[PDB]
């Protein structure tokens, strides 16, 4: 790893340097710090931490601050290493409830 890697050669250092997001399950005001780079990494962590059985999928990760559904993995890695990710295993209450 000593190979000078700060911009040259592929495998950049800014390739999702682990995104410790805070997953939260409705009906339980409890956030969990999970270090995940790509969505796949975060989702899984939310499954073992929130126990999101595979029967509740497709799960819906909506930001508790705004509520934007994050069903992708190229726009949820921007926020700093910390964000309120509300996991909705097709059951937990949504973070909207006509709250416009």
């Amino acid at each position: 790893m000593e190979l000078s890697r700060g911009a040259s050669a592929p495998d950049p250092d800014d390739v999702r340097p682990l995104k410790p997001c805070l997953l939260r399950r409705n009906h339980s005001r409890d956030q969990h710090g999970v270090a995940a780079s790509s969505l796949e990494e975060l989702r899984s962590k939310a499954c073992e931490l929130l126990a999101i059985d595979k029967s509740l999928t497709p799960i819906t990760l909506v930001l508790a601050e705004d509520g934007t559904i994050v069903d992708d993995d190229d726009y949820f890695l921007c926020l700093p290493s910390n964000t309120k990710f509300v996991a909705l295993a097709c059951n937990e209450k949504w973070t909207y409830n006509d709250s416009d």
Binding site: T68, I69, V70, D71, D72, D74, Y75, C78, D100
Partner: protein, 87 residues
């Protein structure tokens, strides 16, 4: 032609009667148009979008013209978004 962008763009797919949206980004304005039509079932030709700021029609030729997270509302070839009105 694969124009290489400097950073993955960002946009928010919000529906009209969905009460929610789909925040997603990508290094290809076209790539985003597809994912959106796949989660909202809205083809590009027989279906487009409209900025939720002033109701600006947007497609695969005027989408990159918008900054990052562009409020892309859902709009099929039949309904139009009045636009963020202040009345």
């Amino acid at each position: 032609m694969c124009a290489v962008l400097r950073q993955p763009k960002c946009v928010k797919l919000r529906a009209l009667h969905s009460a929610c949206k789909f925040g997603v980004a990508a290094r290809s304005c076209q790539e985003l148009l597809r994912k959106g039509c796949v989660r909202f079932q809205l083809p590009m030709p027989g279906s487009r979008l409209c900025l939720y700021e002033d109701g600006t029609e947007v497609t695969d030729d005027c989408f990159p013209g918008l900054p990052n997270d562009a409020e892309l509302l859902l709009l099929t070839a039949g309904e139009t978004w009045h636009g963020y009105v202040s009345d």
